[PDB]
Structures are given as C-alpha cells and as structure tokens.
Design a protein around this nucleic acid. Structure first.
Ligand code: MG
Ligand code: MG
Ligand code: MG
Ligand code: MG
Ligand code: MG
Ligand code: MG
Ligand code: MG
Ligand code: MG
Ligand code: MG
Lengths: 116, 188, 66, 151
RNA sequence: UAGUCCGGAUUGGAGUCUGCAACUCGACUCCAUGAAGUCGGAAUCGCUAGUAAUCGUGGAUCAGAAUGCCACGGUGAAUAC
RNA sequence: AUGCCC
RNA sequence: CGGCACGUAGCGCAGCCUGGUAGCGCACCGUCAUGGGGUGUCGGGGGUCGGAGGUUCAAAUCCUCUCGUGCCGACCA
C-alpha cells in the first residue's frame, strides 16, 4: 500500500491499483504482476509484505513519477528552447500534432475567451 | 431624549413629533433678509410611509426617536407574527400584520430583510430586492396561435402572482424582484 | 515535561526492506513495517538515472549512419 | 392520423408465460432493438417480484397495473387568452400502455444497482401503492379532478 | 455507482507503411499520459414498420490519405383517440 | 387575448 | 462670501447613517425567434467610488483639506 513514493488503494485489484501510479498503465501493470508472479485478481489488502517488496523491485525496474515528470518537462523545454515548430506550438498553447485551430482546440486553449 | 432644532437636522435624522415617528428625507434651510429664518423639510411619516411636508421655524422642533433599521433574518410567520433573529443579537424580534404591509407575499424564509423598528417594535419590513420563489399553480405554456409577446400568470408559494414567459411550468423556482413584482430568471 | 498533557511516547521497532530494524522511540503506538529507509534510499546511486541527460547525436548515429 | 383510421399490429406473446401484455412490456423496456436483453431483464425482475410477493408473477404484475392504471387524464386546448386542461376518459388499451410506460420510467429513474432490481422495486411498490409511478397516477387524477369543470 | 476497470481528448517517447519527399501537413501501431463530460437554456430536428433506434460490412474517388458520400445486411420498437 | 415595420 | 448638497458603470439613481459585499434600471456583448429589422426569450461582461492626507486591524462609508458643479441671499441705514 505504498510503492515508488505514492500510496496505492487497498480495496481494488492489483492491476488497477498499480495503474494508480504515474508511469504505469494497464499493460504495464499486467507486465509487473506477471514478472513478480502475483495474480491479477488479488487486491492489495491480503498480500505478503514480501510480495509488495517484489512489486517494488519491478516498478523500480521501470520509470515512474519523479524521473518521468523530469524527463517529460525536460523534453518539452528542449522543444520550447530550440524554437522549432513544435516548440512554438507548445509556447503558445496550441495543438502540436497538427490539428485544426479554426475550431476545436478547446483542450489546448482551455475554455473559450469572448471578444472585448 | 435629545431635542433637535429646525436649523439643525439635515437629511436622514428621525424625529418623534406628535407621537408619530418621522424621518427627514430632505430639508433646505432658508435665511431670508429681514425675516425669521426657517427650513422647508420633507418628512417621511415612518408609519404609513407617506411623505408630509413641513416648514419649521428656526425656533423649535422636536426630540429624536428610537428608529433603528438593521438586517434581521426572517424566520417564520406563525399566525400573525413575523419573527426574526439578529445575526448578532439573536433576538426573537417580532412584528405584526400592520407592520408587514404587503411584503408578506414577498417573504419566504431565511430572508435577511432590513427592518425599521421603533422603540423595540418593528413597524415596517423591507423585502430584499430579488427573492427566489417557486410556482405552485400555472396552466401549461401551450403556445397555440400566439404571434406575439403574450406571457403567463403564475401563482406562487406565498400567494403572490406574477407573469412568467411560457416555459416555466410548476416546480420551477423563478427569481422575482420584490420592488416591481416581476419575473427576472428561472433560477437554474 | 508536564504529566498528563502529552501523548504516550514508547519504544517502537521499525523494520525496513533493507532488512534492518530501527528500534526508536515514537508515538505510532504499535510496531512499524517500513519500506524504505535512509541507507537504502536511492540517494547515492541515483544521481545519474535521476538526471538522465543523454545525447541526440549519439542516439542518431546509433539509429543510422553513413 | 388524418386520412383513415388504421388497425393495430399483432404482437407475439412472450415465451415464458405467453401473455400479450407482458410482451408489450418487454417492448416498452426495450431500447435499441435489444429485445433479448429486455426479455432477460423483465424475466429476472418478475422472478424477484414473485419471490417477494408470494403469488405468481402474473397476478403480481397485474396488481401493479391495477394500481398504476389511470382512468381520466387531461389534454390542453388553449381556448382564448388562457390555455385549458380538458379531462377526457382513457380507453383501456391506452391506460394499459401508459401504465406500463409510467412504471418503466419510474424504474429507469430509480437509483438501485441493476435494472432488474429497479424494476422489481418499482413493481413491488406499485403493488403496495407506493413509488413515483403511483405518484404520477395520483397527480394525473388530481389534475383531472381539479379541471373537472370542463367538457 | 466513484469522475470509476466510464470517457477518450491532449501530450512525451518509440516505430510501420505508401510516397522523389510525411517540418509546415498523412494514416496507422506500441508504451506512458488521462481534459472536458454525470444527459445538456431559450430554442429546434428526424421518423408511421422491417420504419425509428442500434450494430457491423463493402464501394467510388485513391500511391497514401474519410466520423463524409453512396450501398448492404443483423436485431428491431412506441404511437396515431 | 397578443401580432409593428419592410 | 458660508452653509450646503452634492460628485459612484456609458447615462439616471441607490448604498454612506449604524466601517469588513459596491448595487438597480436603461444601455453593452453572444445566441434564439424572423424571409429580414424590431418587440420578445435565453445567456453573459462591465466601475470598485472627484483627488490628496490622516482615525483604524481595515475607509466608497468616519474625519480634514482641496477641485468641479448646483441652490441659497449678499440686508438696515
Ligand atoms: Mg494505452
Ligand atoms: Mg487534419
Ligand atoms: Mg403515495
Ligand atoms: Mg415520476
Ligand atoms: Mg467533471
Ligand atoms: Mg454516474
Ligand atoms: Mg409517411
Ligand atoms: Mg453506420
Ligand atoms: Mg420606421
């Protein structure tokens, strides 16, 4: 109920529980439970502490929140500092993968801002 | 127990003359040449709310009265008494039917209403600008052949009636302004 | 130290996954099942995987070359 | 509609009990043309209700209907400046149909876990004269007995 | 019964393919990320039966590039006083 | 019951 | 000259008494209704109080001095 620095819920199954980490989706958690030999239908309550330490070793074999956010922001900032096209798009808060902006950019532009 | 002179009171003050409370809405002091100066005051009879005008000679006027107005949160009307609780003195301040003049229809509950009480008895109630009420009796909004503005009368939870557009049905809380008595919104 | 006013402060043994037990006074009441302590925290052998610089030209001429 | 009155189509009865009105019911419950899932849901709810009620699911269903089934309802007319509420009788097929519709709508609104359980609760409460369904029936009778003066 | 094992937007990294050439500006895949959204105001649209609703499949155009368009079936209603 | 003008 | 009564959103007014929230109508913006305009319906945004200095924990409010305005009479010889 504590892994890689974050607290993991107890009432839910092990795969979903492990997904509660930043850097572990469903397939990643399936891989974790496989490598550790822990089933998927087991909830975090009713595990050996040792089992939990094994999970800790596996997730350590992966990359999670601290280093992950570090490298994400580092790449983003490398873009924004080069000033390449993706960089400028990040800077101005517009879609980067090439979507249209004549409408439907609400995720990158937040809510709409009326004229004043 | 303070007596006020005519050339003393400017707007706002509350007077007690003739055993009826008054309140100066406006007063212009005149000091003619070769005459005794005086003041044309516009009084507000704090009992019926009807204005009366007086010219008071520089000589004398009258004592002030216990006319105090402050927010009191409406509690409940049981029978004929409209209770309140000061937010800060928490007093079971009670008025009566005369004191509530046709503001009842605008009064619901938990409503902070500025009231004027004279010598520990409220003589008047001012309902808040807007009040959220719920319609309880309204025929449907059947558009039919209307080619124009129209509207719809609607009985409210306090007995009050007001015109509402067409779509509000029953169970809708409509914001109505106590001053005019008219619809403002549907309270979503 | 007043008498009644403070919570109970007793000796508690705390066991880590580094395999060491930390006997210490504390207020948790019960014992302690600890996961990561000072001597096992990746603070000495983590300052390179934690910084993760890398190099674009190296990655490139790895992916392909002349 | 306007030109020529027209006959109603035939519906085949349900498998389990073979009752036309029960087959109508599955239909009303049905959504997206998922007749199979609708049948499953109504059958499970009927089982639950039969167990809670003792007597067989048919008389259970029917007493629920006997409680929710209205007899008079109102239709607006807009005579002049004011709109009206004309109280008109309900023909038997109509009362059956909208009784079922009110029941299933109550169920859909209810806040239980699964639809079978919602429907079970609704049919039970209707049989015992409770719930939003019979509340709606009461409101409709009440609007009619308010606007009785019209005919 | 949770903003969730709902929702998939956005974004990072790594690739496949067509194509002289995917930066502006393709589609697609894997890992991670997990917004808004809890049924939508006034207002408004389609539908009378194999219809509405719902689910998939194909074609044209075309190297690549469809939630569009044109077709095909599967299940399959309510109601019309 | 309301319904003005191009 | 004083007394006096003001100065608050684009305009008209509240609030100030009794310091701790600046509101109310019109206007303004975006839909909707309409063949189109208007009426109408549904949504929204707007100033933070003429200016300066003090009382205070805190000033649109209480003080004081200014400035722009209104009304007042400035008489008996
Ligand atoms: Mg994924
Ligand atoms: Mg595109
Ligand atoms: Mg009842
Ligand atoms: Mg109901
Ligand atoms: Mg949300
Ligand atoms: Mg939900
Ligand atoms: Mg037809
Ligand atoms: Mg399709
Ligand atoms: Mg004209």
């Amino acid at each position: 109920a504590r892994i890689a620095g974050i607290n993991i819920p107890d009432h839910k199954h092990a795969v979903i529980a492990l997904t509660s980490i930043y850097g572990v989706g469903k397939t990643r958690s399936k891989a974790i439970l496989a490598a550790a030999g822990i089933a998927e239908d087991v909830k975090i309550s009713e595990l050996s502490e040792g089992q939990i330490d094994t999970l800790r070793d596996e997730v350590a074999k992966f990359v999670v929140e601290g280093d992950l956010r570090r490298e994400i922001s580092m790449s983003i900032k490398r873009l924004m500092d080069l000033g390449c096209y993706r960089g400028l798009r990040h800077r101005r808060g517009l879609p980067v993968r090439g979507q249209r902006t004549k409408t439907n950019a609400r995720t990158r532009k937040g809510p709409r801002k009326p004229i004043k | 127990m303070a007596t006020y002179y005519s050339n003393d009171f400017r707007a706002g003050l509350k007077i007690m003359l003739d055993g009826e409370p008054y309140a100066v809405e406006a007063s212009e002091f005149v000091k003619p040449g070769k005459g005794q100066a005086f003041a044309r005051v516009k009084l507000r009879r704090l009992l019926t709310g009807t204005r009366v005008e007086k010219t008071f000679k520089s000589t004398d006027s009258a004592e002030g009265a216990d006319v105090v107005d402050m927010n009191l949160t409406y509690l409940y009307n049981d029978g004929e008494f409209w209770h309140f609780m000061n937010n800060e003195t928490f007093e079971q301040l009670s008025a009566d039917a005369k004191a509530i003049g046709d503001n009842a229809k605008w009064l619901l509950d938990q409503a902070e209403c500025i009231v004027t009480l004279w010598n520990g008895q409220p003589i008047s109630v001012t309902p808040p600008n807007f009040v959220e009420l719920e319609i309880v009796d309204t025929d449907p909004g059947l558009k039919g052949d209307t080619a124009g503005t129209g509207g719809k009368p609607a009985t409210l939870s306090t007995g009050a009636v007001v015109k509402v557009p067409l779509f509000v049905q029953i169970g809708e809380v409509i914001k109505v302004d106590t001053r005019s008595g008219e619809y403002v919104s549907r309270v979503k | 130290m007043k008498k009644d006013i403070h919570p109970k402060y007793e000796e508690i043994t705390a066991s880590c996954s580094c395999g060491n037990v930390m006997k210490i006074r504390s207020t948790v009441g019960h014992d302690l099942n600890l996961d990561v302590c000072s001597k096992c925290h990746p603070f000495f052998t983590g300052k390179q995987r934690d910084v993760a610089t890398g190099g674009r030209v190296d990655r490139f001429n790895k992916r392909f070359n002349i | 509609p306007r030109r020529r009155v027209i006959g109603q189509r035939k519906i085949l009865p349900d498998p389990k009990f073979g009752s036309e009105l029960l087959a109508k019911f599955v239909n009303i419950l049905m959504v997206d043309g998922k007749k199979s899932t609708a049948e499953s849901i109504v059958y499970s709810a009927l089982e639950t209700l039969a167990q809670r009620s003792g007597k067989s699911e048919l008389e259970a269903f029917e007493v629920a209907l006997e409680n929710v089934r209205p007899t008079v309802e109102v239709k607006s007319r807009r005579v002049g400046g004011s709109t009206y509420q004309v109280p008109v009788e309900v023909r038997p097929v109509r009362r059956n149909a909208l009784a079922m519709r009110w029941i299933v709508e109550a169920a859909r609104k209810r806040g239980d876990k699964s639809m079978a359980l919602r429907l079970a609760n609704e049919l039970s409460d209707a049989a015992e004269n409770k719930g939003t369904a019979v509340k709606k029936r009461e409101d409709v009778h009440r609007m009619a007995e308010a606007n009785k003066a019209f005919a």
